[PDB]
């Protein structure tokens, strides 16, 4: 069973927002415009009973102040009511300003993606089904007591939270972000814990968001932090120069991921998956694409994932080329299918009719419109296979060794 997370409620919230717009209604009506929903088991948000339980929940991983700071800005934003000097300083000091700002809803906007990931993930806790689906979700940025990257409530912190503190031996959960940009929030969020494995593989380079996940500062030379504490080694990153295409993202990710599910063997993989690599995003970093038989990263990496048999949450994330991201992930949930129910969905190449169908034009087909082309990753290979084995040691776990090499 696949299942994944929609609601009238939810679609108005995750479409509310000022900078992804109706991103969300894209992806959701191509998917059904592609006859996936009936295949599809529909998760429904999450719901508290009180104020109470709902704060109890969100402050599991913020803060009190923040919750309650961006429950105000919320209301200052709803009534024309505006922001005295001390308004100005209590929002400055969690950073909810300049490209985290407030508007009507950021708040119920925010909370939306918290509600849609905790409900997928006690889906797969009770093994209602083998692989959920949130493309609301995914804002790794967002910290303890901060906004970043238009990420308030960090949802995916919340959502692996509620893995671990389930019974399984000892419940494990294996993190991996194909963000363009480096997964920070939910890297610090288990910084000391060993049983969260965070793995990130993004674009880094001077001055570029968030300028994290990557070597550091004095000690003379620079060294490449992975976790602290008792969770030393757990946190993994692979930072790429601009321009890296299908193949050689496949081939860079595709040995870290095997070693990183055969050393860990988790009980829960959640996957950011989210949807700036594409060549065509605005960005223009990476160049990626949605083809599948020169198959794309994204599906490849997902493929790889699916094949480990682990129940696994697929969240969305990042990703401004509207319908672009509704053609990656249309394409990742028919994966998903294909891949978990054993049922082969075939996409006709031509953008099914229905509402948003103008907005796939001029062409209006199921590929984005990029012809692609075209070593310091085997020196980054080399570096991530000596901090799994110091992983592994330091958690007294055992592992072949050898056909962990054997995979490069
Ligand atoms: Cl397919
Ligand atoms: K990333
Ligand atoms: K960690
Ligand atoms: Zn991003």
Redesign the pocket.
């Given at each position: 069973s696949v299942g994944i997370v929609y609601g009238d409620q939810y679609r108005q919230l995750c479409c509310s927002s000022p900078k992804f717009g109706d991103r969300y209604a894209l992806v959701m009506d191509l998917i059904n415009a592609y006859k996936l929903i009936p295949e599809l088991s529909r998760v429904p948000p999450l719901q508290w009973d009180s104020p109470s339980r709902m704060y109890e929940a969100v402050t599991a991983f913020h803060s009190t102040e923040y919750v309650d700071a961006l429950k105000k800005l919320q209301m200052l934003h709803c009534e024309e009511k505006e922001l005295t000097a001390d308004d100005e300083l209590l929002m400055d000091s969690f950073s909810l300003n300049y490209d985290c700002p407030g508007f009507p809803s950021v708040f119920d906007y925010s909370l939306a993606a918290v509600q849609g990931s905790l409900a997928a993930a006690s889906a797969l806790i009770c093994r209602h089904c083998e692989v959920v689906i949130n493309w609301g979700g995914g804002w790794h940025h967002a910290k303890r007591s901060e906004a970043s990257g238009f990420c308030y409530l960090n949802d995916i912190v919340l959502a692996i939270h509620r893995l671990v503190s389930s019974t399984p031996r000892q419940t494990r959960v294996l993190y991996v972000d194909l963000d363009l940009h480096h997964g920070d929030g939910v890297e610090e969020a288990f910084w000391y814990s060993p049983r969260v494995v965070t793995f990130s593989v993004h674009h880094a380079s001077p001055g570029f968001f968030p300028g994290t996940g990557t070597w550091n500062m004095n000690d003379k030379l620079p060294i490449f932090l992975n976790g602290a504490g008792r969770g030393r080694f757990s946190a993994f990153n692979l930072p790429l120069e601009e321009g890296i295409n299908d193949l050689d993202w496949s081939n860079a990710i595709g040995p870290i991921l095997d070693s990183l599910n055969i050393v860990i063997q988790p009980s829960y993989v959640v996957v950011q998956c989210g949807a700036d690599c594409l060549a065509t995003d605005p960005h223009r970093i990476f160049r990626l694409t949605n083809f599948?038989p020169s198959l794309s990263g994204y599906l490849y990496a997902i493929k790889k994932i699916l094949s480990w048999k682990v129940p696994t949450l697929i969240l969305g994330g990042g990703g401004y080329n509207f319908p672009d991201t509704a053609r990656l992930w249309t394409?990742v949930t028919?994966?998903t299918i294909?891949e978990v129910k054993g049922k082969?969905?075939?996409?006709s190449p031509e953008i099914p009719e229905h509402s948003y169908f103008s907005r796939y034009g001029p062409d209006f087909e199921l590929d984005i419109d990029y012809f692609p082309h075209e070593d310091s990753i085997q020196k980054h290979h080399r570096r991530i296979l000596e901090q799994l084995r110091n992983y592994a040691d330091l958690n007294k776990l055992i592992y072949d060794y050898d056909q962990v090499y054997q995979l490069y």
């Open positions: 599948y394409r028919a994966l294909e082969k969905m075939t996409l």
